[PDB]
């Protein structure tokens, strides 16, 4: 039972690490896209609520 619980914990930790790596990769891709296109296009979103 302890081995099964450890396996479940390891699976959860692996899923968490995969999510963190995916978030880091998405952040890097978004940063590259912002550097290429330019953040100025987001300025129009300032009037959504303000």
């Amino acid at each position: 039972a302890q081995a099964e619980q450890e396996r479940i914990r390891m699976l959860s930790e692996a899923k968490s690490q995969i999510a963190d790596l995916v978030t880091l990769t998405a952040s890097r891709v978004l940063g590259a896209e912002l550097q290429a296109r330019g953040h100025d296009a987001l300025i129009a979103e300032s009037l959504a609520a303000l």
Partner: protein, 147 residues
């Protein structure tokens, strides 16, 4: 009433002019050092206040006091200090465009544009104590919640 209003406005303008002119006069200079630096470019009350401010040497933000002089004519409250933060350094045209755009409150409010390039392509606009955050870093965390 009317006479007081013109008098108050004239006094405020004179004080602002004196502070702007003589702010750097006794700036930093200590009580003994700025005593000679203290010019006749102030009223006796204004000269006394400048001497008190420069006795310790903190006569650097006197221009802000000058900026405090005109607003005190109209009871101030027009500060509406807002702060805009975007990942890319703001170009002057778009900076002015968004300065004009936040006219819902008081118009071109006191805005201290920042960068903080840790953000990705978004706006963090803090007006008073209300902050609006459409930065893609915020969306990043709001998707990363899946963790």
């Amino acid at each position: 009433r009317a006479l007081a209003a013109p008098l108050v406005e004239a006094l405020l303008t004179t004080a602002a002019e004196q502070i702007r002119a003589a702010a750097p006069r006794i700036a930093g200079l200590s009580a003994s050092e700025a005593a000679a630096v203290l010019p006749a470019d102030l009223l006796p009350q204004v000269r006394n206040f400048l001497l008190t401010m420069a006795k310790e040497g903190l006569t650097g933000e006197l221009n802000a006091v000058a900026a405090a002089l005109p607003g005190y004519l109209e009871t101030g409250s027009r500060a509406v200090d807002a702060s805009v933060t975007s990942a890319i350094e703001l170009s002057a045209e778009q900076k002015e465009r968004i300065t004009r755009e936040l006219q819902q409150r008081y118009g071109d409010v006191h805005v201290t544009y920042h960068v903080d390039p840790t953000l990705i392509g978004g706006l963090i606009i803090r007006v008073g104590d209300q902050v609006l955050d459409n930065s893609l870093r915020a969306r990043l965390s709001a998707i990363q919640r899946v963790l």
